[PDB]
């Protein structure tokens, strides 16, 4: 069993999965040449999280873990990185949810079934340290979007499902980080305490799971970790980067019963600041972005366990095709790169944008 004490990112090396590497090497590289083609090959070596966005994706988790075990037998000392993302009525505030399960149709029961598959894999592979991000774009909606019917009506289901997940996946080789939106979402002073209270309640309600290390921020977003100047779109919010956000909500977590909570922040698309966002709330395939700070535990900051790449750069946020199912108007805005494919599908021009504007640079 891959047990640990303190920062779960220390003493191991994040595994760069074959799934993403295949996308870059087979979907991106054949389209590139020279310096760009060579720089792209390097991107595939940067470890990023594998999303378990459907039940059909679970066999891929075992395969990935099987690969890691093989590597670790040869002294690899690698850790798996996955995202649990299949809540019923998922993305309640989104103008189009791609979730396969729905509350009305036995969604909660199907979610628990999904979690059971995952626990058995983790139990089977207890020898591998597994780092997980728990349900992005879920609890954050319950803080600011209860005005939206779907979100208000998904509350109990979200909390029950999240509870089942954190308790069932509370194992010695596991480290879970609950998604907590980002500075532009829950960072605003007015949302700080309410948000901190909800996360603290999830922790305590789950019997303070030892495997629940803390929270994940900026997942699939573009905020800078420590930028020194407030971009125009953050006007009014003193908390304009992720460092300020975790340092503001951290003590509040402690005030509400959850002490020793740490964080991980996505920087996979935070390399260029300011971004091309015309409005902070614009989240779909944002123009003017690049790969950011590389995954590492050497954060020079007490509260941040590690810089991570959760949302895999190159995989689309949503389609700009207005006739397509699940079309979200946010993906057709002037600050969104178009034309864009279905969410999760490979978006070549975006990968190229990210690679071109990368910092640290790959070229």
Ligand X SMILES: *[C@H]1O[C@H](CO)[C@@H](O)[C@H](O)[C@@H]1O
Ligand Y SMILES: CO[C@@H]1O[C@H](CO)[C@@H](O[C@@H]2O[C@H](CO)[C@@H](S[C@@H]3O[C@H](CO)[C@@H](O[C@@H]4O[C@H](CO)[C@@H](O)[C@H](O)[C@H]4O)[C@H](O)[C@H]3O)[C@H](O)[C@H]2O)[C@H](O)[C@H]1O
Ligand Z SMILES: *[C@@H]1O[C@H](CO)[C@@H](O)[C@H](O)[C@H]1NC(C)=O
Which residues are identified as catalytic?
A: 137
178 contacts 136 by C-beta, under 8 angstroms:
no
CB of 224 to ligand Z, least distance (A): 8
- Supply 182's token pair: 């980002």
Do residues 251 and 302 make contact, with C-beta atoms less than 8 angstroms apart? Answer: no
CB of 336 to ligand X, least distance (A): 19
The nearer residue to ligand X, 296 or 329, going by C-beta atoms, is 296
- Please list every residue from 289 through 308 that binds ligand Z, using CB under 6 A: 293, 299-300
Q: How far apart are CA 91 and CA 9, in angstroms?
A: 28
CA gap 312, 289 in Å, rounded: 13
312 binds ligand Y (CB under 6 A): yes
Instruction: Tell me the number of residues near ligand Y by CB under 6 A.
Output: 22
Q: Give the residue with the Cβ less far from ligand Z, 228 or 323.
A: 228
DSSP letter (8 states) at residue 330 = G
Q: Is 359 in the site for ligand Z (CB under 6 A)?
A: no
Q: Are 16 and 340 in contact (CB under 8 A)?
A: no
Q: Does 72 bind ligand Y (CB under 6 A)?
A: no
Q: Say if residues 257 and 206 touch (Cβ distance below 8 Å).
A: no
Q: Which stretch binds ligand Y (CB under 6 A): 72-80, 90-98, 107-115, 299-307?
A: 90-98
Per-residue binding letters, 54-93, with ligand X (x by CB under 6 A): -----------------------x----------------
Binding positions for ligand Y, 100-139, rule CB under 6 A: 136-137
Q: Using CB under 6 A, which of 10, 26, 156, 257 touches ligand X? A: 26
Q: Are strands 78-84 and 130-134 parallel, antiparallel or unpaired?
A: parallel
Site for ligand Z in 151-170 (CB under 6 A): 156, 159-160, 163
Return d(Cα 161, Cα 140) in angstroms, integer: 15
Residues 327 and 96 sit within 8 Å (Cβ to Cβ): yes
Q: Which does 264 bind (CB under 5 to 8 A by kind): ligand X, ligand Z, ligand Y, none?
A: none
Q: Which of 88, 134, 137, 85 is nearest to 284 (CA)?
A: 137
**Which residue from 158, 203, 245, 283 is in contact with ligand Y, where contact means CB under 6 A?**
283
Residues 199 and 235: beta-carbon distance below 8 Å: no
As measured in angstroms, the least distance from the Cβ of 79 to ligand X is: 8
Distance CA(268)–CA(51), nearest Å, equals: 14
**CB closer to ligand X, 199 vs 351:** 351
Tokens of 329: 């108007």
Q: Which positions touch ligand Z (CB under 6 A)?
A: 156, 159-160, 163, 201-202, 205, 225-226, 228, 293, 299-300
């Amino acid at each position: 069993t891959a047990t640990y004490s303190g920062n779960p990112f220390v003493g191991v090396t994040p595994w760069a999965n074959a799934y993403y590497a295949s996308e870059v090497s087979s979907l991106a590289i054949p389209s590139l040449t020279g310096a760009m083609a060579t720089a792209a090959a390097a991107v595939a070596k940067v470890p990023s999280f594998m999303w378990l966005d459907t039940l059909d994706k679970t066999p891929l988790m075992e395969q990935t873990l099987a690969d890691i075990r093989t590597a670790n037998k040869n002294g690899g000392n690698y850790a798996g990185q996955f995202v649990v993302y299949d809540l019923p009525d998922r993305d309640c505030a989104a103008l189009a949810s791609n979730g396969e399960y729905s509350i009305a149709d036995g969604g909660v029961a199907k979610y628990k079934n999904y979690i059971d598959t995952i626990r058995q894999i983790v139990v089977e592979y207890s020898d591998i340290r597994t780092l997980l991000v728990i349900e992005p774009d879920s609890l954050a909606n319950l803080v600011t979007n209860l005005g939206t019917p779907k979100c208000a009506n998904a509350q109990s289901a979200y909390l029950e499902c999240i509870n089942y997940a954190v308790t069932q996946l509370n194992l010695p080789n596991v480290a879970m980080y609950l998604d907590a939106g980002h500075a532009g979402w829950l960072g605003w002073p007015a949302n700080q305490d309410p948000a901190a209270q909800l996360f603290a309640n999830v922790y305590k309600n789950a019997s303070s799971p030892r495997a629940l290390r803390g929270l994940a921020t900026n997942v699939a977003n573009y905020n800078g970790w420590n930028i020194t100047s407030p971009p125009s779109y953050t006007q009014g919010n003193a908390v304009y980067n992720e460092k300020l956000y975790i340092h503001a909500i951290g003590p509040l977590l402690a005030n509400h019963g959850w002490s020793n909570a740490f964080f991980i922040t996505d920087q996979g698309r935070s390399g260029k600041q300011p971004t091309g966002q015309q409005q902070w709330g614009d989240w779909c395939n944002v123009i003017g972005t690049g790969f950011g700070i590389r995954p590492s535990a050497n954060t020079g900051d007490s509260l941040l366990d590690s810089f991570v790449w959760v949302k895999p750069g190159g995989e689309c946020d949503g389609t700009s095709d207005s006739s397509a199912p699940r079309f979200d108007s946010h993906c057709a805005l002037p600050d969104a790169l178009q034309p864009a494919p279905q969410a999760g599908a490979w978006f070549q021009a975006y990968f190229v944008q990210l690679l071109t504007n990368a910092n640290p640079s790959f070229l």
